C-alpha cells in the first residue's frame, strides 16, 4: 500500500555544551535550548534562542534558586 | 471482546515483556487466579476463559476481571511483501507478567472456586495457579 509518515528534521544539536566548572571565555555558548529550561544567572546572558552565553571568562556552576527550583546558570569568576 | 474506546494513537510499538508483575495481592475478591508463566492474552482469550468460568459458578456470585488489553497488534495480510507501511490492527493483547492476578471471585465456597479456575486455565496459553486472599 502506501505510507503517510517519514518526515522529520535536521536534529538541532541542542543541550549543554560547557558543563560545570569548566572555564569559558566570555561570549561562549553554554546551553543551546528550546525554551528557558535553564535560566540565566550571574554573569551569564540569555540570547534570542534561550542560549545562555557566558559573559566573563570564568567557570560555570548550575544552581536552583527562588521558589520554583529552576536550574540556574551562573559564572564563578576566575 | 474487551476493546478500548478512542485510544490516543492507533498503532504502537512491539515492546518487550521483561520485568515482574504489580497486581500480586488479591484485593477485590477472596480467591484469585494468579499467572505463573510469561506470555500475553489476546482479547478473545479473556472473553473465552470468562464464559467457561462464569457458567461453573452459576450466575449468583461476583467475578472481577483484573486485566485489560489496551495494546494493539498489527498483522500483515496474505501474499503481501515486507515493508510498505505498518500492518492493520486486528486484535488486542494484554502483556502478562509472572505474578499478575487474572481473575478474582467472591461469594462461592473454596471447592467451587477450585474446580472453576481450572476450567478457565485450560483456555489460556499461560500457566496459572490458585491463590487465596491473605491478611495484610
Amino acid at each position: 500500500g502506501s505510507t503517510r509518515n517519514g518526515r522529520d528534521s535536521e536534529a538541532k544539536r541542542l543541550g549543554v555544551k560547557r558543563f560545570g566548572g569548566e572555564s569559558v571565555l566570555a561570549g561562549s555558548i553554554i546551553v543551546r535550548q528550546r525554551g528557558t529550561k535553564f535560566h540565566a544567572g550571574a554573569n551569564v546572558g540569555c540570547g534570542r534562542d534561550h542560549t545562555l552565553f557566558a559573559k566573563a571568562d570564568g567557570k560555570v556552576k548550575f544552581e536552583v534558586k527562588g521558589p520554583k527550583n529552576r536550574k540556574f546558570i551562573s559564572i564563578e569568576a576566575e | 471482546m474487551l476493546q478500548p474506546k478512542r485510544t490516543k494513537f492507533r498503532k504502537m510499538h512491539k515492546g518487550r515483556n521483561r520485568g515482574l508483575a504489580q497486581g500480586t495481592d488479591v484485593s477485590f475478591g477472596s480467591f484469585g487466579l494468579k499467572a505463573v508463566g510469561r506470555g500475553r492474552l489476546t482479547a478473545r482469550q479473556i472473553e473465552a476463559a470468562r464464559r467457561a468460568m462464569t457458567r461453573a459458578v452459576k450466575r449468583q456470585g461476583k467475578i472481577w476481571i483484573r486485566v485489560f488489553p489496551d495494546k494493539p497488534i498489527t498483522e500483515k495480510p496474505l501474499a503481501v511483501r515486507m515493508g510498505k507501511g505498518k500492518g492493520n490492527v486486528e486484535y488486542w493483547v494484554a502483556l502478562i507478567q509472572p505474578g499478575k492476578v487474572l481473575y478474582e471471585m467472591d461469594g462461592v465456597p473454596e471447592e467451587l472456586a477450585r474446580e472453576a479456575f481450572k476450567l478457565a486455565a485450560a483456555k489460556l496459553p499461560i500457566k496459572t495457579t490458585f491463590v487465596t486472599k491473605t491478611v495484610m
Binding site: - | 500480586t24 495481592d25 499467572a35 509472572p98 491478611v135 495484610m136
Partner: protein, 94 residues
C-alpha cells in the same frame, strides 16, 4: 506464645540476600522506638507454617535473638510473585 528463633545478619545486599534465600531462609528486620534497626536472620520453613494462622498478623510476636527476647508485631511482608514463599518481613519493635 509465638516464638521465632533468629540470628544476626553479617552480610547484607542483593547478593547476600539471594545466597540466604536459596538455603530455605529469608532475612527480616526489627525496628521501632528509638533504638538501632537490628538485621534479623531466620529460617523460612518455620515462619511459613506460622503465618497460616490468623493470629500471626495480629498478636505480639516473640523473636529470640542473641539470647534476648524482643516483643514485636507484623507490619509489612513481601510475598514472592509466583511461589508460596516469603522474602522479607518488617517487624515493629513494640
Amino acid at each position: 506464645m509465638f516464638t521465632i528463633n533468629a540470628e544476626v545478619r553479617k552480610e547484607q545486599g542483593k547478593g547476600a540476600s539471594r545466597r540466604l534465600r536459596a538455603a530455605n531462609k529469608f532475612p527480616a528486620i526489627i525496628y521501632g522506638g528509638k533504638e538501632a534497626p537490628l538485621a534479623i536472620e531466620l529460617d523460612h520453613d518455620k515462619v511459613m507454617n506460622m503465618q497460616a494462622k490468623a493470629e500471626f498478623y495480629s498478636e505480639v510476636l516473640t523473636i529470640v535473638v542473641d539470647g534476648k527476647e524482643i516483643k514485636v508485631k507484623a507490619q509489612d511482608v513481601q510475598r514472592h510473585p509466583y511461589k508460596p514463599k516469603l522474602q522479607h518481613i518488617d517487624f515493629v519493635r513494640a
